């Protein structure tokens, strides 16, 4: 099943053009950042981690909202994404579904799948047909960008965590029919060998699996439960698919968070820099060669794209935050590790062995997994045997090296593993022809700078280390004091011992310079490739790795290029930053930073030295309470003057849903009528008979939904909402009705997205939204005839620019008043801070200017006070819905919105719906716009995507 000659493989790793590669990869979802001109930003930050690969989903639900009309342009265009990857020199793994899970509405499935007469994710002909147009279009786009045409796409994942075997095979043939030629890779939810090579029909080319050892309950970030760290993955691999290279297609890099959850902060505090350093070195101990972190950039579930088991934010506690910042320590810690892999090709050939206790150390409190292959060059991964230990452990190593079984340290001192940490010790490590016999401190990187070799080593604080070099030369200390450093010669080797310190030492041994850093100073180093024509580094290759330089900076280094005699750095800064360039080429004479000539200095050792001053600019943000807010009633349906005669009639005698038969005379399932997204409104018309006393109603909006009911203009009550309840049972009492008169029951229902469909055969995505059942006491159910609406036009959705999910069924949304320049001068003055005095729903509108300085990346947030009322709000920024706030469920109160969506030197239109589900009415406790550290950026101009303004819609009601 090999079908091209560019990407091949053996049992050890992939090859790209006959050369081994370790794919260190990050998950990014373009649809979760609707600003195409910011995608390159994400790639820069991932390449700067030392990654060479990105993994991404395509969301069917946003691309074919209307059946038969595939649409992937503007903010949903796939091409600028592929271009950005190419520009940053990042390979892509494409995971198009058609089912993607991803914590998005429907797990990727459009709402109209609720009308399809076949089992989802099965070889049922109607379901296969339903996916045909989507895959023929999406996979075609992926095909043009394959590496066989010089694009970045090197692999393709069919489906997602699957389990007929027939179904899998079909999805593969379906992609092959669209010219996908690259190898197929799988993502088994657990390591069970599902669909591995040899499993019959549906077998992929390369077996891959997932793992999230700590799960997703972020409630107790400091606690790592016993026995959760996997230790058998390399054994399982050899049993399940030894012919293909070991592959982790999703490994934990954060966690998702449900409505009513602890928040992504605690999620980060659980999956922090200790998690990464311990767990990721653990994955290297299995000899993983394709290794993707889910998520490495989370983004935002803007425009209702998310599923009910999650809220607006998808920060995920990821290495790169929702606001795209790289402050988290996990980021800097991942960078140390990825740079070691990038610099260490012998890692791929160093065959993994069973883990050991008490063999390579005296203690059994440590576990050691050796990586030893057919040729010299080995690695020993060390961690506490109980991975959760906070203990600080002292130990000595007995390692087998080319100079014999050595006991280390050979000179003074002891090694330390302090708490939740892990080390990769190297033996017979080749630095360009110089053999490092061993080194206990970890490798960051090494380069040959044509004549002189540089090796960068680091350890954590208060640690002692040693290394040995096969060398005849003497040992000189060319920077720092010899305080704490001892050396001696033993035959044809040179042994060096040292204490970790916050001040760098550099030691020279012949033509080899060894940098000795502490972990926290190594955090500030970068290893960018140095292209000599153009500013793009190109894809990752051993030749491009070989001609990289070492740079000490601060917040971020995007890249570097050599323009004749000018050395260019492209960087971001969040503080005054000392810069150092190590390994500048001999022709280089001048330093440029972000296109500006910068003064520099050369020391006795030929290291370049410069500085960039940081001075926070003044940031003027309007106070939101001071704005000229306009109020509009966006539930005019609960006034007796409203005419619903244009509404669709809910009069289907049979549902097309195969998963939940009706309990009502007609279908009140919203997807039967093409409404899948946003708030839903139902209207039940009946003639009274004077015998009515109670009205019972079961509503369903997905977990954490609310609903409110009126009889004519009289409020009956609300299902207030909770995190566990996907549905709600409500009984309301009725004082006597006027026999013979018309009455209308109005029901408003929050829809928080459609379910995923994780278990094949269970059909949970077909869980309907709307009214499940009802009983009007003293009346026959068929006496009530219903109208309903969701978003105007249903599947004939109005906003092509913002996609089929962005706007819901509120009156203001049906008219398009959430868009720029609403017709609001005629509206009443009213702030959401004053709010409503009775149940109902208000719509609030205002505009403000921003005038933020060019050259600065500044995260902006909408902040909501929490007064704990049962109130629901939707935020819109220039037409884009960027927040669902619910005061009695939580936890989100701060809502970031990216530049592009916000206009930083122009006008912005904010809109806000406020729904009161309590009889006293409701208000916002506070509503402030805030910011966090302004970053001096070397990124270019951020272009806004289309922000279509308000315009009168044909047939709005
Ligand atoms: C502004 O501030 C205000 C005030 O501070 C904030 O409001 C508060 O928000 C929180 C969070 O939303 C609210 O707490 C939640 O309330 C839920 C609902 O409570 C009611 O419903 C259930 C009924 O279900 C049972 O019974 C029915 C029939 O009656 C059955 O059909 C059903 O199946 C069940 O058997 C009742 O259990 C509950 O009863 C209590 O109250 C009554 C009356 O007081 C008593 O008589 C009862 O005896 C009992 O005391 C009540 O009727 C509730 O479901 C939910 O519970 C979950 O979380 C609890 C602990 O949460 C704390 O710690 C969390 C971290 O763990 C924090 O995130 C959280 O904020 C809080 O501090 C657990 O005890 C409970 O077992 C549930 O755990 C699940 O969720 C946790 C959090 O995600 C997870 O850690 C757990 O692992 C677990 O997760 C699993 O299940 C969930 C679904 O539940 C899945 O999502 C998940 O993936 C996984 O499968 C919680 O208690 C609180 O009510 C509210 N306070 C007020 C005053 O309104 C507001 O949020 C804030 N706003 C903003 C914008 O920030
Ligand atoms: C040399 C130097 O200086 N070096 C220095 C260096 O600089 C760097 C720097 O950092 C840069 O980042 C740079 O990176 C570059 C990179 O080099 C290049 C690689 O070549 O790529 C760069 O970015 C490019 C992007 O990749 C794209 O290619 C982009 O292309 C876009 C074009 O630019 C743009 C021009 O306008 O057009 C876009 O396409 C849009 C169209 O414009 C169009 O109008 C579309 O509008 C649509 C609308 O989207 C949809 C919404 O769905 O609706 C459509 O109409 C609908 C409508 O809704 C109807 O209802 C209808 O419905 C009908 C239906 O049709 C049917 O008939 C039925 O019967 O009835 C229905 C009724 O319901 O449907 C219609 C359907 O049409 C609209 N259509 C219409 C007609 O109205 O939207 C399109 C969006 O898709 C292009 N995009 C695409 C995808 O095509 O160009 C980018 C380049 O921009 P730039 O030149 O300005 O920069 C990349 N740049 C970036 C930002 O990454 O690298 C350089 C290296 O030089 O920096 C160094 C380091 O510091 C420094 O040192 C160095 O010196
Ligand atoms: C400009 O950008 C730069 C990045 O380029 C930003 O710099 C980063 O800023 C973040 C904070 O936003 C730093 O992360 C934090 O650092 C705290 C610890 O200090 C670290 O450095 C000191 C030396 O100065 C070391 O001694 C520490 O190492 C030791 O401790 C750690 C953690 O305990 C151990 O794992 C090590 O083994 C060492 O023993 C650190 O390296 C740190 O406290 C903080 O971490 C806490 O909070 C996170 C979650 O928020 C938890 O995951 C973690 O467990 C910590 O929580 C501890 O304390 C809490 C109380 O809150 C307890 O409840 C817990 O049990 C636990 O004990 C966090 O990691 C980051 O290092 C830094 N990066 C760099 C490269 O400088 C700037 O912020 C930015 N500037 C501006 C203006 O924006
Ligand atoms: C990198 O990205 C991450 C993730 O995107 C960023 O982390 C988020 O940062 C935001 C903003 O700081 C943060 O939201 C705040 O959390 C604080 C702690 O819980 C809150 O104190 C704070 O709310 C108060 O302050 C706001 C102004 O700062 C007010 O507008 C708001 O009303 C709140 O009011 C406070 O003060 C008043 C009176 O003073 C009082 O009445 C209140 O009770 C309260 O004391 C914000 O909500 C998020 O928690 C973070 N989100 C996540 C997922 O992490 C990070 O900032 C970025 N780093 C950089 C450097 O940019
Ligand atoms: C309850 O509300 C409805 C409107 O939703 C009222 O319906 C009106 O009733 C009169 C008399 O039958 C009709 O001529 C109007 O055409 C109706 N309006 C609409 C838009 O249908 C009804 O009267 C209200 N009932 C009570 C008892 O107040
Ligand atoms: C609303 O009421 C229905 C029952 O009318 C509840 O659904 C039942 O739940 C039990 C146990 O969870 C199941 O075994 C039954 O099969 C269900 N009955 C039916 C007819 O669906 C539902 O849990 C209630 N909703 C809430 C939020 O309490
Ligand atoms: C081999 O590794 C397993 C975990 O996979 C471990 O429990 C066992 O003790 C190891 N065997 C040896 C060589 O000690
Ligand atoms: O964030 C949790 C993740 O779980 C994975 O197993 C799944 O493959 C992803 O689609 C996502 O749901």
Curated annotation (Swiss-Prot):
A GO molecular-function descriptor: galactose binding
Alphabetical list of PROSITE patterns matching this protein: GLYCOSYL_HYDROL_F35 (PS01182)
Protein's cellular compartments: Secreted
Swiss-Prot/TrEMBL catalytic activity: Hydrolysis of terminal non-reducing beta-D-galactose residues in beta-D-galactosides
Predominant cellular place of this UniProt entry's protein: secreted
Binding-site list for substrate: 57, 101-103, 160, 210, 316
InterPro entries to which the protein is assigned, alphabetical: Betagal_dom2, Betagal_dom2_sf, BetaGal_dom3, BetaGal_dom3_sf, BetaGal_jelly_roll_dom, Galactose-bd-like_sf, Gly_Hdrlase_35_cat, Glyco_hydro_35_CS
Cystine connections: 218-267
Active site residues according to the UniProt entry: 161, 250
Family annotation (Pfam families): BetaGal_ABD2, BetaGal_dom2, BetaGal_dom3, Glyco_hydro_35
UniProtKB keywords: Carbohydrate metabolism, Disulfide bond, Glycoprotein, Glycosidase, Hydrolase, Polysaccharide degradation, Secreted, Signal
Gene Ontology terms: biological process: lactose catabolic process; polysaccharide catabolic process
pH dependence (UniProt free text): Optimum pH is 4.5.
Enzyme Commission number(s): 3.2.1.23
Family that this chain belongs to: Belongs to the glycosyl hydrolase 35 family.
Task performed by this protein: Cleaves beta-linked terminal galactosyl residues from gangliosides, glycoproteins, and glycosaminoglycans.
Protein name: Beta-galactosidase A
Originating species: Aspergillus oryzae (strain ATCC 42149 / RIB 40) (Yellow koji mold)
Organism ancestry: Eukaryota, Fungi, Dikarya, Ascomycota, Pezizomycotina
GN (gene name): lacA
